[PDB]
Amino acid sequence: AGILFEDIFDVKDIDPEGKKFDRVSRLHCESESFKMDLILDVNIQIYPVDLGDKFRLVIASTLYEDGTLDDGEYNPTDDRPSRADQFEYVMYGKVYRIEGDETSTEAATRLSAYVSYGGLLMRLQGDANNLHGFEVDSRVYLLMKKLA
Amino acid sequence: TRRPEIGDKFSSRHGQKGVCGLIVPQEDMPFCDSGICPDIIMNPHGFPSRMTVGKLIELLAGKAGVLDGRFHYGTAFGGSKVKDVCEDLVRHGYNYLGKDYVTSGITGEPLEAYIYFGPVYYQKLKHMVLDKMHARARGPRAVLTRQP
Amino acid sequence: QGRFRGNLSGKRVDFSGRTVISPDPNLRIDEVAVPVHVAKILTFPEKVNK
Amino acid sequence: IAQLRPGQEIDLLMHCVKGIGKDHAKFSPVATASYRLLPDITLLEPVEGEAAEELSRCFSPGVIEVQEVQGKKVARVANPRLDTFSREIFRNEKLKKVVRLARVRDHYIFSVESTGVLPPDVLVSEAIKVLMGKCRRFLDELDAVQ
Amino acid sequence: AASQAVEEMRSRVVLGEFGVRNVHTTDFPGNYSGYDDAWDQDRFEKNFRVDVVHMDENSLEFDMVGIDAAIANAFRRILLAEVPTMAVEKVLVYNNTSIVQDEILAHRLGLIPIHADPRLFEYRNQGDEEGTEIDTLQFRLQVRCTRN
Amino acid sequence: DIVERHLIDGDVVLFNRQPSLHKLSIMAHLARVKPHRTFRFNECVCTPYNADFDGDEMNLHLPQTEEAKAEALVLMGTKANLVTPRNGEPLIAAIQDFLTGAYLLTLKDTFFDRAKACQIIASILVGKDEKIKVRLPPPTILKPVTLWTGKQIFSVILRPSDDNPVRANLRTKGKQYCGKGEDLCANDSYVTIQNSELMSGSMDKGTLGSGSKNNIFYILLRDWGQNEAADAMSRLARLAPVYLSNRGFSIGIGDVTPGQGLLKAKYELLNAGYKKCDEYIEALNTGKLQQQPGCTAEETLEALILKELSVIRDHAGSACLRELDKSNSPLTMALCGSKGSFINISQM
Amino acid sequence: KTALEMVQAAGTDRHCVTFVLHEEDHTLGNSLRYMIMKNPEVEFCGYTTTHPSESKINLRIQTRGTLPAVEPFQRGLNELMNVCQHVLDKFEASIKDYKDQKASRNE
Amino acid sequence: KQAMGTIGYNQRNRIDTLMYLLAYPQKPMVKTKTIELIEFEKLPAGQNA
Amino acid sequence: MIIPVRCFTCGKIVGNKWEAYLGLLQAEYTEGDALDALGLKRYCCRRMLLAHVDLIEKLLNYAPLE
Amino acid sequence: GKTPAEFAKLNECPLDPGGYFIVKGVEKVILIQEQLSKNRIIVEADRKGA
RNA sequence: ACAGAG
């Protein structure tokens, strides 16, 4: 595998401060299996997300499950079996800031990871044991499938 | 007989003076559905700082006027109102605020924003670059001080 | 208009020109377009060497 | 051309030559040549009643027809080609949400008005050959280099 | 649905209240998930049709279906700028005594359209002030005004 | 022998507006000969000269000596004079239609497919950039559609080829920052440029313009050298017109027309404010007025009236800006700071 | 005289080259770019006018694999020519069909 | 005051130090009442663009 | 001075409509009916006749003659 | 008191305002001069504040 | 000596 993180997320709010943009919506989500809160921008024109939807979000280091990190360039035209065939939405971006929780003065374990998908931001916040394998200046694939 | 070139000063009856900066062919102008392309393209950036709202109304009153054979009055503290000319434009099938669906002449694809289109009175000013270009290499000198 | 201000501290100079200015964004910021009519007049003395 | 008074005289001699319109605008053969994509105004919900009349006045005078089906007025799109898109359906507050003003992308409606030099069916045929001629010229230079 | 939104996005220019959307052309290979947008001459020759809807003296309206903006705009630009015609370039004036200035009269006579078929004539060479049978026509205007 | 040749491309030539208030009013430029009669220069250099292209005239001087070329080129060159001597702030930077085009490009709503990404980027491939391999970045969105977010296209200004060494870094507050987001703000107004890639935030006057520091061209100047700043400015001057002229950007009478939500609010404010003034009129002429300390009773009345009348403008002003939509062209120019202000919008 | 000049990118063995189409403007540029972008072996394609005073366009092509960019460019010219050949045959058929119908009516 | 236009009806029989004329002048499409009092729309200075 | 031969914006020949336009205004058409009867659909052509001043009809009095 | 048909014999324009002289062939206007009213008691402050 | 222009 080349998976960093994987969990099922439930959408809890769609626009906290109003609809600032047409195509983009700021999804605030919470995970069942782990206590992870998720901020995520998605293009809601190509992929529409509703306030009750439940989706599976995998973050992966490589899009080919055989664990070959060979990415000189990404060719859209090329067709081979990959991980994206199982998922509806895919984004490519870079982890750019790992930051500690400020809200407790002692004995804390929550971490924030920030990923930017060309300006579509993600904050993934949770226990340090679940965010393992994130490093600054690393490039990750988000993958996302809605569940019935 | 002089034809307008780069550097010739034109003005527009509201203090929006401006020198000619580029002359582009008819094939490169943006064009409406009816085939009209502008004689002059004016930059929108002049209006916010200068608040020449009267130019914006003159364009609208004139457009509603040419379409029905009227001269609309622009008299101080009076004149033809926006509410009257808006109803003239929609009767002739144009948008009530003069904005039109404009196609790019370079790419052929349509422009995203609607573009304001109308007839604005433009007056040519006496200041022409041909009467102002000057160069000296060496030449005649004064008699008292032997300097140019 | 006396000697010290008008003719000594500042003075009329040759190899000089003046024209209306107009924009051109396709030039670099270190460049200026000079018209051919000024360029044919404003000469520079190039010393001949190898 | 001119206008005279007695004793005044004009005598001259003209030389007509061939040129393209990129050189000077007196050579262009068209009054205007343009195109527009074709409208397909579609009704998302059925508009009945006296809202059918005010939907037929937010458009050009021949596109929305109001028809009686049971002694009741229902509106349908009839000829969306004649629409000029004045966007009057957005001044109305109740009917912004029942229409989808659009344009078919791959369907153009050319309008070529000639000035009289040669008729416009020959103008389009000549215009297509010019683009064929531009492609032919650079194929010759790829052959000349290689 | 995501698929219904994709189909609108690649086939309809939609007009909003504040701006047009889906303006660009997108049917290129690798822009979409399952679609095969590579060039296929047989698919072009099948879909393309031309319908002439109106024609009379000096006017023509016709529909092209299945061609792209990048080629329809080429036809628009050739008709404006690159289809040749015959027009006056030189005026040889003998005894002009009218109030109309000679430079203005020559400009007016230039803009008169001449019925000569331009395919039968060649381009006049560089220089060559006289010209010949192959590449020039000649007109003579001569008017004397007198009292009745 | 001495040959008095014509002025040719690459001559060092002095260029000067007639009133000079500082040293940057006269700078040295490399000449290029062009057919039309005017002098022409890139509009990023309008701010040092205080030039405005409304029939303005400028002077040109041709130094007649090799020693005068070198002093002009090394000391007075524009690339050596990007910052004013006074406070050390950049003056050669982006201006109107290079700030507005950059702002609209870097907004979160912009997505480009491969054909339009290439056609915006290919504009920069002119001049000395004609030999570089263009480095189209990987797309952001992959599975439903292949989209490039407009921030990536902007980053091609800062690093246009794989061999270019520039690694710019910037982290600053934008103009319309809410103050609590810390890169998660709702306005998308916090700027991060990490390794010459724009990770968040739109580009305002405060990041691409001449006002002050925290400017990415100032970062390039201080961290990578003069030539890198001058290249990026030439790329922005070339790229942003190609976007903006094919997006369309226009102002109309419908962009300054008061909606019904304001006309009710304005009527309430005028009636309330005038009636509060009328009571203080009565309290001066025919009663007690609480005379403020240090002023006479008449003067105390002027400061109360000016208080009421300021409240009317500010409350009516903050009512119009809440009912304006986005893509209102004065509001875009006010937000990015390219021209105008929220006073001007509220005033018209 | 020559209307075409090829300018290879400095590091790249013929897969990146800029084509200076002389005596041209947006008319050929945008149409030819469209046919080249329809080829799945092209990575980047786009044109710029060097200056409004200059009738040049710098058409850049970059290809994915090992193939030289001359081959997409030549295929681009040929397919555009075949499109314009087919557009003409359809147009002239519809004009003749319209004239024949109009002459067959009211007679 | 500086706009090119038409001095008057005697402008062709008039010899002056310097005179500017516009070839095809047009009268304003939007006009004041003051324009009608001074008769500016008889010898106008400008063109509708 | 005299009616321009072509419309500035599109190049339709409006220079032959002038002697007709004045004639129709003697038959008491309105301006907006007179331009519609001559074929001036687009408003850029309409302003050629609507905004024109016939100066040459008045300069030609002062002009010298036998 | 002439009619517009008789201005044409004099080569003059009916709309020409007059109000000016012709002296040695140049048209010269006496401008309106603004003045203070004589025979009026000004009451004003001196430089020294008296 | 006056009027302009920035």
Ligand SMILES: [Zn+2]
């Ligand atoms: Zn016209």
